[PDB]
Amino acid sequence: RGILLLSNRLGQLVDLTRLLAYNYETLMACITMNMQHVQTLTTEKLQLTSVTSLCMLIGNATVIPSPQTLFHYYNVNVNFHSNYNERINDAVAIITAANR
Amino acid sequence: DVNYILNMDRNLPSTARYIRPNLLQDRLNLHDNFESLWDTITTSNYILARSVVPDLKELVSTEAQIQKMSQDLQLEALTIQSETQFLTGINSQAANDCFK
Amino acid sequence: PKESILKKLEDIKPEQVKKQTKLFRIFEPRQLPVYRANGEKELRNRWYWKLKRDTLPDGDYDVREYFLNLYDQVLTEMPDYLLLKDMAVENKNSRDAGKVVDSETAAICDAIFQDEETEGVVRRFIAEMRQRVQADRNVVNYPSILHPIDHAFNEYFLQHQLVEPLNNDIIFNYIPERIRNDVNYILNMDRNLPSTARYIRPNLLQDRLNLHDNFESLWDTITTSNYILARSVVPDLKELVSTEAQIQKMSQDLQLEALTIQSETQFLTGINSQAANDCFKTLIAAMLSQRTMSLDFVTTNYMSLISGMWLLTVVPNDMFIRESLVACQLAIINTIIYPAFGMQRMHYRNGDPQTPFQIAEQQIQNFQVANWLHFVNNNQFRQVVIDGVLNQVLNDNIRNGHVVNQLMEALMQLSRQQFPTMPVDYKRSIQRGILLLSNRLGQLVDLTRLLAYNYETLMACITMNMQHVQTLTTEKLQLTSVTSLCMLIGNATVIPSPQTLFHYYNVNVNFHSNYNERINDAVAIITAANRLNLYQKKMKSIVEDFLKRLQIFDISRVPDDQMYRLRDRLRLLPVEIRRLDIFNLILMNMEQIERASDKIAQGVIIAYRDMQLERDEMYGYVNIARNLDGFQQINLEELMRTGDYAQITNMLLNNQPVALVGALPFITDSSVISLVAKLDATVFAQIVKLRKVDTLKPILYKINSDSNDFYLVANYDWVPTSTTKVYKQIPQQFDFRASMHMLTSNLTFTVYSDLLAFVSADTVEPINAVAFDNMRIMNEL
């Protein structure tokens, strides 16, 4: 009986797939930092509770990243990067000098 | 990405000048030893993300669904370990959380 | 509440009528000055066609949706039938009265018949334009003035309305083909309807939705309903051994005392003057409705069990839920048959799933005992189809139905295990209860008959092809009541009151009619909804209304889900010719409507090059093209949807010959000046600033140096130079002579509702009733 609730809703569950598909596939675009897959030392708890909800509980909704939103994102990683790279240079420069 | 509109409005004098962002890559492969720090980055990069991920909309009234759910679920039918499948609630939230 | 879902049922009157009056009008003819080439008003004036209500909006999309509503209006308002004498007026002129069709027809005549028209031919015609009746066929000949599009409508309405005849024979025929036949009943009537009858036809096609494959929650609601409905029927039992008397001899047969003893728990079975009636009703509906019930027993009340065997021998186990037959049987198997039949050595160990009656079969030997097992175990329903039309009735194995050699056998098998044993006393209490069934067996033979009939009767009147699934609200039944009914009955004979039966038919009927009908109403819409590209009228819409219209279902209290799935099935459903046949009509001309009528346009062209203007008569000569031959295009609808790719933005900026398409706001101007100044090139600029357009009001130049105080120019000699005209056909003109059509219908009708009523139903004396075996049902003193 529970299974069926996934099935009927399946017509919609589809929608979910599309959603993420896009979103991730979108947002991502604006990331400068590369990203190698690593086994973080820390976790993040995800209660099947919520999961289950999202599932049978999403309608013909449709939401996406506000323009302004997107930029703001780029902008940040950007700066950050710039700082990382920059300090790096600032760092190196010193150390090497420090030697001769 | 069709869905998004682009347009220019202001002009640019041959006076226009900016400073390179400088986005060299990793340069430092922390991906193979500095776990402690990755965890800290991930975390960071993570929160950052939630801050962006658009909030959802138009969901099915919490009550409505869970109710047709009990009709379908046949909850209290002998089985000893009741009311552990319905701590599901706060979905109007759980989904948003699960999603982000 | 219990009888709060019943008032939602008996209160369902779907046999809704729809009477028409005013004809069905879209465009009324109208005045307007005439402008001969050259542009002067030659006087006299002419008559054309313009729509009643330019309602029409802005944006191809909004347009499409608009029409759609028309479809919904058409249907609600779709003539269930008509009648022309009811819509009669009189003609001011003619060889006489003439009586015409619809006030508007009248007006028009008198009107044209004064404002110096095309003279003779018109007045003339208007004269000899009357009525005439051909009584001999009930036919009627009226006139009526309308409009090509109007005759269009009203016409099909004559040919498709719905009122057949009605003779004694038909009334007789609507009465279920298995009841008129059932002997035990009689029928007799009070009238003879004349040749003028018309009876409407409650149509009852099947549930083309198999609600029973994904939607257990709606079914559940139906079942429930259908169930309560049933109880409302189930006859109330009659005269049965006064409660006290029986229960008293009951204590006796057994031998009680003050030292404690076990029979004692077989008497919370008393109350039956409540229990038997409940147990009885309950049982039927269950079957009819086809609901699945549960079981409330006690392991100490063995009697209550014995009676179970009564039950089980009946209702093909599948009718009860799983976890219930399970308990029941094993409880019998392990505390009643093995335990006092020297067959208990292991005490029977069972650990869930497989079948527990079953396995006892292939284990112990004894014939009497052995037949019970196979007959009970493999006993099922006979999946029967046709019954004087697709009734699809789940029937009870002929056998059982009074040829109760089942009960006699159920007793003989009981008469023979009461032989061996093990725990000395225990047998005393057990076999003593067993005997109480045997003596009563003369009467038990009856209970069977009763149900047998009743179910087998009520049945027929259920057009709602019932099936065999699993409920989920499981009505509750106690072995308490069961046991009561059992030993406490006999001599009596009861049966379905006539009036009662009908009432039942009637209901399911309506209901059906509604289901089938809404279905059609539903489908029709959805399909239309598609050949209209309404990617924005999110359908979560139709389903909602649909369900509602068959009260019982708490709409808000049902997830959007099921709803959609409901559409998914509806979509594949055929409209009803009626339905379809109309949509084809609306579309087919659609174009014509839109084009005509003001407020709107179609599209505009922008050739940055001076050019001529047509010289039509209606309007003076202006900016119009009925072709847009050449140039390019760009759907506006898709534009404001897509988001405009500066494609337009660029072309506008760069100045290139182009066109636009869709719903549009026209704007009329006069003072020629405007034109020479070339105002029309302005407007456009805007767009550049606002990606989207609707703020776009194109221009038209009604130019007739007559009404344009600035004729100063028509003077010299000219010929209209414009840059950009407009897409919009031209309002046809009005040819009276031909514009009129002729009509046919029928006279003095006689519509009826309900039917049946015309019959007085009586019943034979109870004492000698008959089942499908021609045997006196209830022949044990």
Contacts of residue C239, defined as CB under 8 A and 6 or more positions apart, other chains included, come to C491, C492
Contacts of residue C646 in chain B, CB cutoff 8 Å? 7
Is the separation of the CB atoms in C712 and C675 below 8 Å?
A: no
C-alpha C402/C-alpha A2 separation (Å) is 43
Instruction: Compare all CA atoms of chain C with the CA of A12 and give the residue at the minimum distance.
Output: C561
Which of A57, A71, A84, A90 is the best mutation test for B, with the most CBs of B within 10 A?
Answer: A57
> Which residues in chain B are contacts of A87 at CB distance < 8 A?
none
Round to whole Å and give the CA distance between C319 and C379: 11
Is C606 strand, coil or helix? strand
Cα separation, C721 vs C613, whole angstroms:
7
Instruction: Tell me how close the Cα of B52 comes to any Cα of chain C, in angstroms.
Output: 24
| Structure letter (DSSP) for residue A29 | G
Residue B1 to residue A26, Cβ atoms within 8 A: yes
Residue A62 sits at φ, ψ, to 5 deg, of: -165, 105
Residue type, C26: I
Displacement of CA C227 from its chain's centroid (Å): 20
C90: left (phi over 0), alpha (psi -120 to 50) or beta: beta
Selected residue of B72, B73, B75, B78 to mutate for chain C interface (largest C Cβ count, 10 A): B72
What is the crossing angle of helices C405-415 and C302-313, to 10°?
Answer: 140
Return d(Cα A7, Cα C716) in angstroms, integer: 79
* Tally of residues, chain A: 100
Cα dist from C219 to B88, C290, C294, C570, whole Å = 27, 11, 18, 17
Distance from CA of B71 to the nearest CA of C (A): 7
The reply to whether residue B71 touches residue C220, judged by beta carbons under 8 angstroms, is: yes
Would you tell me how many other CB atoms lie within 10 Å of the CB of residue B13?
A: 6
- For C191, half-sphere exposure in the C-beta direction (CA atoms, 13 angstrom radius) is 10
Print burial letters for C576-596: b (CB count within 10 Å at least 16), e (below 16). beebbebbebbeeeeeebbbb
Question: What separation in angstroms does the CA of C378 have from each of C267, C706, C772?
Answer: 32, 97, 23
The span from the CA of C47 to the CA of C94, in Å, is: 22
CA distance B76 to chain C (A): 12
CB-CB under 8 Å, A5 with C564 = no
B61 class by beta-carbon count within 10 Å (0-12 exposed, 13-18 middle, 19+ buried): middle
The DSSP symbol for C402 reads T
Helices C479-487 and C302-313: crossing angle in degrees, nearest 10, is 80
Burial class (CB in 10 A: 0-12, 13-18, 19+), A39: exposed
Question: Residue with structure tokens 């047509």?
Answer: C614
CA nearest to C719, candidates C584, C571, C638, C611: C611
CA of B10, closest CA in chain A: separation in Å?
A: 18
- CA-to-CA distance for C292 and C316, rounded, in angstroms? 12
Give the integer Cα–Cα distance in Å for C462 and A5: 31
Bridge partners of B6, per DSSP, are none
Using beta carbons and an 8 Å cutoff, which residues of B are at the interface with A?
Answer: 1, 3-4, 21-28, 31, 35-36, 38-39, 42-43, 45-46, 48-49, 52-60, 65, 69, 72-74, 87-88, 91, 93-95, 97-99
Specify whether the CB–CB gap between C666 and C598 falls below 8 A.
yes
In angstroms, this model's resolution equals 3.8
